[PDB]
Motif scaffolding. Structure first.
Motif, PDB file in Angstrom:
ATOM      1  N   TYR A  27       1.357  -5.656   3.781  1.00 37.92           N
ATOM      2  CA  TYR A  27       0.566  -4.708   2.845  1.00 37.92           C
ATOM      3  C   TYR A  27      -0.711  -5.529   2.745  1.00 37.92           C
ATOM      4  CZ  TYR A  27       5.643  -3.254   2.516  1.00 37.92           C
ATOM      5  OH  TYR A  27       6.512  -2.832   2.543  1.00 37.92           O
ATOM      6  N   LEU A  45      -3.956  10.325  -7.460  1.00 33.85           N
ATOM      7  CA  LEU A  45      -4.306  10.622  -6.087  1.00 33.85           C
ATOM      8  C   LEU A  45      -5.351  10.316  -5.221  1.00 33.85           C
ATOM      9  CD1 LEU A  45      -4.977  14.666  -6.131  1.00 33.85           C
ATOM     10  CD2 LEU A  45      -6.814  13.112  -5.088  1.00 33.85           C
ATOM     11  N   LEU A  48      -3.332   7.223  -3.919  1.00 34.33           N
ATOM     12  CA  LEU A  48      -1.657   8.114  -2.784  1.00 34.33           C
ATOM     13  C   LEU A  48      -2.307   8.222  -1.681  1.00 34.33           C
ATOM     14  CD1 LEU A  48       1.019   8.165  -5.269  1.00 34.33           C
ATOM     15  CD2 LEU A  48       0.326   5.976  -3.420  1.00 34.33           C
ATOM     16  N   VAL A  52      -0.940   7.235   2.087  1.00 39.02           N
ATOM     17  CA  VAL A  52      -0.515   8.799   2.438  1.00 39.02           C
ATOM     18  C   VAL A  52      -0.865   8.716   4.438  1.00 39.02           C
ATOM     19  CG1 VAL A  52       0.343  11.174   2.972  1.00 39.02           C
ATOM     20  CG2 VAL A  52       0.553  10.205   1.067  1.00 39.02           C
ATOM     21  N   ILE A  89       7.573   8.445   6.352  1.00 35.73           N
ATOM     22  CA  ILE A  89       6.777   8.093   5.093  1.00 35.73           C
ATOM     23  C   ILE A  89       7.930   7.869   4.209  1.00 35.73           C
ATOM     24  CG2 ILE A  89       5.406   8.096   3.357  1.00 35.73           C
ATOM     25  CD1 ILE A  89       3.633   9.986   5.502  1.00 35.73           C
ATOM     26  N   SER A  96       9.780  -1.074   1.480  1.00 38.29           N
ATOM     27  CA  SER A  96       9.481  -1.666   0.022  1.00 38.29           C
ATOM     28  C   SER A  96      10.035  -1.354  -1.060  1.00 38.29           C
ATOM     29  CB  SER A  96       7.736  -0.860  -0.254  1.00 38.29           C
ATOM     30  OG  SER A  96       8.472   0.457  -0.267  1.00 38.29           O
ATOM     31  N   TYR A 113       4.701   0.746  -7.261  1.00 37.58           N
ATOM     32  CA  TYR A 113       4.530   2.206  -7.994  1.00 37.58           C
ATOM     33  C   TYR A 113       6.272   2.485  -7.502  1.00 37.58           C
ATOM     34  CZ  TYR A 113       0.973   1.496  -4.050  1.00 37.58           C
ATOM     35  OH  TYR A 113       0.030   1.116  -2.965  1.00 37.58           O
ATOM     36  N   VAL A 118       3.593   8.284  -9.197  1.00 37.97           N
ATOM     37  CA  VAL A 118       4.160   9.458  -8.131  1.00 37.97           C
ATOM     38  C   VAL A 118       3.642  10.704  -8.820  1.00 37.97           C
ATOM     39  CG1 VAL A 118       5.650  10.440  -6.862  1.00 37.97           C
ATOM     40  CG2 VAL A 118       5.602   8.106  -6.485  1.00 37.97           C
ATOM     41  N   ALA A 121      -0.201  11.089  -9.234  1.00 41.06           N
ATOM     42  CA  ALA A 121      -0.521  11.983  -8.247  1.00 41.06           C
ATOM     43  C   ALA A 121      -0.657  13.711  -7.749  1.00 41.06           C
ATOM     44  CB  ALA A 121       0.406  11.693  -6.596  1.00 41.06           C
ATOM     45  N   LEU A 131      14.397  11.994  -4.886  1.00 43.85           N
ATOM     46  CA  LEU A 131      13.389  11.115  -3.824  1.00 43.85           C
ATOM     47  C   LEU A 131      13.640   9.974  -4.010  1.00 43.85           C
ATOM     48  CD1 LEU A 131      11.105   9.472  -1.870  1.00 43.85           C
ATOM     49  CD2 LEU A 131       9.901  10.241  -3.308  1.00 43.85           C
ATOM     50  N   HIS A 215       8.853  18.976  -1.146  1.00 40.53           N
ATOM     51  CA  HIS A 215       6.958  18.521  -0.686  1.00 40.53           C
ATOM     52  C   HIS A 215       5.694  19.278  -0.230  1.00 40.53           C
ATOM     53  CE1 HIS A 215       3.981  15.868   1.699  1.00 40.53           C
ATOM     54  NE2 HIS A 215       3.767  15.554   0.478  1.00 40.53           N
ATOM     55  N   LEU A 222      -0.724  21.964  -4.605  1.00 40.75           N
ATOM     56  CA  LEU A 222      -1.919  20.274  -5.559  1.00 40.75           C
ATOM     57  C   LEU A 222      -3.406  21.119  -4.265  1.00 40.75           C
ATOM     58  CD1 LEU A 222       0.399  17.208  -5.758  1.00 40.75           C
ATOM     59  CD2 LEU A 222      -0.803  18.647  -7.311  1.00 40.75           C
ATOM     60  N   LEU A 232      -9.550  14.324  -0.697  1.00 41.31           N
ATOM     61  CA  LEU A 232      -8.290  14.163   0.145  1.00 41.31           C
ATOM     62  C   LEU A 232      -9.037  13.284   1.445  1.00 41.31           C
ATOM     63  CD1 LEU A 232      -6.446  16.025  -1.348  1.00 41.31           C
ATOM     64  CD2 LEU A 232      -5.657  17.071   0.591  1.00 41.31           C
TER      65      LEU A 232
HETATM   66  C1  LIG Z   1       3.519   1.172   4.065  1.00 42.31           C
HETATM   67  C2  LIG Z   1       4.747   1.783   3.050  1.00 42.31           C
HETATM   68  C3  LIG Z   1       5.162   3.158   3.871  1.00 42.31           C
HETATM   69  O1  LIG Z   1       4.785   3.409   4.789  1.00 42.31           O
HETATM   70  C4  LIG Z   1       5.263   3.803   2.647  1.00 42.31           C
HETATM   71  C5  LIG Z   1       5.061   3.948   0.474  1.00 42.31           C
HETATM   72  C6  LIG Z   1       5.112   4.337  -0.332  1.00 42.31           C
HETATM   73  C7  LIG Z   1       5.885   5.068  -0.286  1.00 42.31           C
HETATM   74  C8  LIG Z   1       6.182   5.620  -1.409  1.00 42.31           C
HETATM   75  C9  LIG Z   1       5.478   5.895  -2.897  1.00 42.31           C
HETATM   76  C10 LIG Z   1       3.988   6.757  -3.203  1.00 42.31           C
HETATM   77  C11 LIG Z   1       4.688   8.280  -2.645  1.00 42.31           C
HETATM   78  C12 LIG Z   1       5.330   8.276  -1.412  1.00 42.31           C
HETATM   79  C13 LIG Z   1       4.037   8.536  -0.735  1.00 42.31           C
HETATM   80  C14 LIG Z   1       6.425   9.453  -1.762  1.00 42.31           C
HETATM   81  C15 LIG Z   1       5.363  11.629  -1.174  1.00 42.31           C
HETATM   82  C16 LIG Z   1       6.813  11.729  -1.311  1.00 42.31           C
HETATM   83  C17 LIG Z   1       4.169  11.254  -1.868  1.00 42.31           C
HETATM   84  C18 LIG Z   1       2.937  11.607  -1.318  1.00 42.31           C
HETATM   85  C19 LIG Z   1       1.935  12.045  -1.866  1.00 42.31           C
HETATM   86  C20 LIG Z   1       1.411  13.042  -2.081  1.00 42.31           C
HETATM   87  O2  LIG Z   1       1.756  14.465  -1.035  1.00 42.31           O
HETATM   88  C21 LIG Z   1       0.280  13.723  -1.680  1.00 42.31           C
HETATM   89  C22 LIG Z   1      -0.281  13.988  -3.473  1.00 42.31           C
HETATM   90  C23 LIG Z   1      -1.129  14.605  -3.343  1.00 42.31           C
HETATM   91  C24 LIG Z   1      -2.737  13.586  -3.955  1.00 42.31           C
HETATM   92  C25 LIG Z   1      -2.882  13.083  -2.388  1.00 42.31           C
HETATM   93  C26 LIG Z   1      -3.527  13.511  -1.652  1.00 42.31           C
HETATM   94  C27 LIG Z   1      -2.105  14.699  -1.204  1.00 42.31           C
HETATM   95  C28 LIG Z   1      -1.815  14.997  -2.681  1.00 42.31           C
HETATM   96  C29 LIG Z   1      -1.140  14.398  -0.293  1.00 42.31           C
HETATM   97  C30 LIG Z   1      -1.055  12.027  -2.106  1.00 42.31           C
HETATM   98  C31 LIG Z   1       7.146   9.537  -0.512  1.00 42.31           C
HETATM   99  C32 LIG Z   1       7.369   7.970  -0.232  1.00 42.31           C
HETATM  100  C33 LIG Z   1       7.131   6.919  -1.749  1.00 42.31           C
HETATM  101  C34 LIG Z   1       4.623   1.605   0.677  1.00 42.31           C
HETATM  102  C35 LIG Z   1       4.679   0.771   1.965  1.00 42.31           C
HETATM  103  O3  LIG Z   1       6.054   0.894   1.698  1.00 42.31           O
END
Ligand SMILES: C=C1[C@H](O)CC(=C/C=C2\CCC[C@]3(C)[C@@H]([C@@H](C)/C=C/C[C@@H](O)[C@]45C[C@H]6C[C@H](C[C@H](C6)C4)C5)CC[C@@H]23)C[C@H]1O
Lengths: 242, 11
Positions: A27, A45, A48, A52, A89, A96, A113, A118, A121, A131, A215, A222, A232
């Motif tokens: 990572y 936000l 994350l 993402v 994703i 992890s 995390y 979350v 975010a 989830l 989602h 959001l 974003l």
């Molecule tokens: C390399 C890797 C993997 O790839 C993934 C790894 C971790 C994965 C995780 C932990 C964190 C939250 C995750 C991404 C969840 C998701 C549903 C939420 C997304 C936010 C997203 O929806 C958001 C909401 C608003 C603010 C911002 C900008 C936009 C508006 C979009 C974020 C599902 C899986 C979750 C780490 C490692 O293992």
């Protein structure tokens, strides 16, 4: 009798390599994301959004290496990626995820995390509860890496995604992956872990559809606020919606 | 819907 053909063995080798080339277990790149903030009016936000957006890039890279995917029209590749991105994703993140403290542990306190992160975010329990349920059930399957990368590929090449043009071609590609997975489990996964395993894996695809739906609903809400949208990345805006 | 960045990453 179950027997992995040379071709099925080749498919598995390609997908393992594709994953290794697109998932860095150190990572290291996370240090380059905008810093996580844990005090909070959506303090996580920026970080994350970046996690993402980074992950979308990697999923795209993985997708391009799926045998058959390149045979699809540009339109279909796009439709499949926009619809599957968040699900893959969720799937790839299971690497992890740890049941110790029910968090995604990416190698340090900074990049660990939990449900509160979350929430910070913008997401609510409507999405977060199922989830975590999903991550737990997936982790308990104790998948071989072979099965993990096959499931991600099967997820991406789904015939029934909205907007798919050549459903037959997409189905043909997925069927080849599915049969590889089914044969792999029969030949290579010892009991009791192999019990109902393929069925349990395919059920996870159904779970992912429901998570995807929720989602998308929450992303729309959001991303509707311009002051959130300004934070974003352009890739997230393009793939999830602008 | 036009996806420049996605399209570019897929090339
Ligand atoms: C390399 C890797 C993997 O790839 C993934 C790894 C971790 C994965 C995780 C932990 C964190 C939250 C995750 C991404 C969840 C998701 C549903 C939420 C997304 C936010 C997203 O929806 C958001 C909401 C608003 C603010 C911002 C900008 C936009 C508006 C979009 C974020 C599902 C899986 C979750 C780490 C490692 O293992």
């Amino acid at each position: 009798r179950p027997k992995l053909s040379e071709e099925q063995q080749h498919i598995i080798a390609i997908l393992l390599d594709a994953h290794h080339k697109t998932y860095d277990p150190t990572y290291a790149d996370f240090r380059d994301f905008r810093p996580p903030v844990r005090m909070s009016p959506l303090s996580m936000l920026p970080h994350l959004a970046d996690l993402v957006s980074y992950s979308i890039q990697k999923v795209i890279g993985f997708a391009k290496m799926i045998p058959g995917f390149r045979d699809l029209t540009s339109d279909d590749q796009i439709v499949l990626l926009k619809s599957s991105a968040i699900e893959v994703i969720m799937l790839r993140s299971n690497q992890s995820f740890t049941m110790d403290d029910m968090s995604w542990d990416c190698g340090s306190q900074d990049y660990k995390y939990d449900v509160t992160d979350v929430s910070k975010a913008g997401h609510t329990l409507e999405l977060i509860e199922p989830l975590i349920k999903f991550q737990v059930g997936l982790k308990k399957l104790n998948l071989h890496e072979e099965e993990h990368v096959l499931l991600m590929a099967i997820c991406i090449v789904s015939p029934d995604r909205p907007g798919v043009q050549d459903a037959k071609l997409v189905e043909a590609i997925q069927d080849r992956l599915s049969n590889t997975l089914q044969t792999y489990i029969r030949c290579r996964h010892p009991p009791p872990g192999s019990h109902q395993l393929y069925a349990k894996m395919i059920q996870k695809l159904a779970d992912l559809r429901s998570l995807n739906e929720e989602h998308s609903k929450q992303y729309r809400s959001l991303s509707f606020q311009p002051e959130n949208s300004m934070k974003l990345t352009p890739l997230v805006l393009e793939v999830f919606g602008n | 819907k036009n996806h420049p960045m996605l399209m570019n990453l897929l090339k």
